[PDB]
Amino acid sequence: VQLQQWGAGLLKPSETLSLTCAVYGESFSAFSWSWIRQPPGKGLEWIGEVDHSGSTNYNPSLKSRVTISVDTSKNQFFLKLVSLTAADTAVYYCARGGRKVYHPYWTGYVNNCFDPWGQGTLVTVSSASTKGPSVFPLAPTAALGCLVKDYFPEPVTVSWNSGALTSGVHTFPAVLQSSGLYSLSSVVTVPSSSLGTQTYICNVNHKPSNTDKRVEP
């Protein structure tokens, strides 16, 4: 059993998210199929489920905006989320739910736990366009760093002294600002006596925009 996932992963607010999950290997019917999402650094949230007959069930938090459809001709099922906001940025997984069980007196789905899972599609909702980062020095055991602000999209690679200085380096995760762009900080702790003799340069490379900052006391 294999799950393939696709769909646009970079959208603007007040737009429609459309994702597709295709299953290979076993019988697409006799199984519930669910969409789940996970915001970056947060917990799992069940979005919805569908079966082969087209009957759906949704999370009450997303009932107004979510629509889950099915296509048994292609063994696929689709997710649609209208009126997007920054709160909808998340990794979206599809998963196989429970098995349909038939008895002459009762029929229903049992063991509605999720396995296997799709690879997961990251979706980012923001009105920002591709912009290069601005690198500002955070001047000074002494701590010193570089602030990488106003860039889009992820990621950005940060090194120190062309990769020489690696111990004591802390590169935090990027934060999505309200403006739609990202901000980041890279810091490093050094001996106080090296501040006068040794030079410190943060090498910041953002390949989406194809864009070395010296930090001075």
Place this chain on the structure above:
Amino acid sequence: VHEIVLTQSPGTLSLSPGERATLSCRASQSVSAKNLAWYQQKPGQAPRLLMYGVSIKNTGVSDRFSGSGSGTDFTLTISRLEPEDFAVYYCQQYGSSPTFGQGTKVEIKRTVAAPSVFIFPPSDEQLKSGTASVVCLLNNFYPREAKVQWKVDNALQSGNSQESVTEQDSKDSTYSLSSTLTLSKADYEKHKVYACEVTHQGLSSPVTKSFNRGE
């Protein structure tokens, strides 16, 4: 249609290898039959079905995992913790419309370490750019729980600061935090004194780092 809220305890379980871990899942209303599951998620990976039917392990799951409980109280037990087991664990109920718990992190335990607090004012180039960012850095601390408060001329600021935290390091098993306070150039040049106050378990008294505009 039946809505069931699952709360996991504790939020963070700090244990050492070789010990046993006990995670609890409380349901606001009874979970029917044995319709509960546990999932394991490692950093930057897809969730993994760990257990279903309260106590039935999935294929390829070691004997060190055990499930128990019923009604509103459920438990996941890890007999001997391995370096692999340190991750996030979620409980999920499927007695009604499926719902997830908020998750419990099993992490490496170490000695309490106090953070080193530093403050960075905005660079003059950034001031000319039209925005100001003040950075408050908390370096090497344990446990993760720490409180950062911004004060601009003794005024408590809210809604204009953003935090970021690194994952527990592989060597010293510590955390690092950064709090960025973002202002406009006018709002920044209006006031003068900027401070961040850090409260932590390792600090006997809240440590405040401040600077005056133009220093």
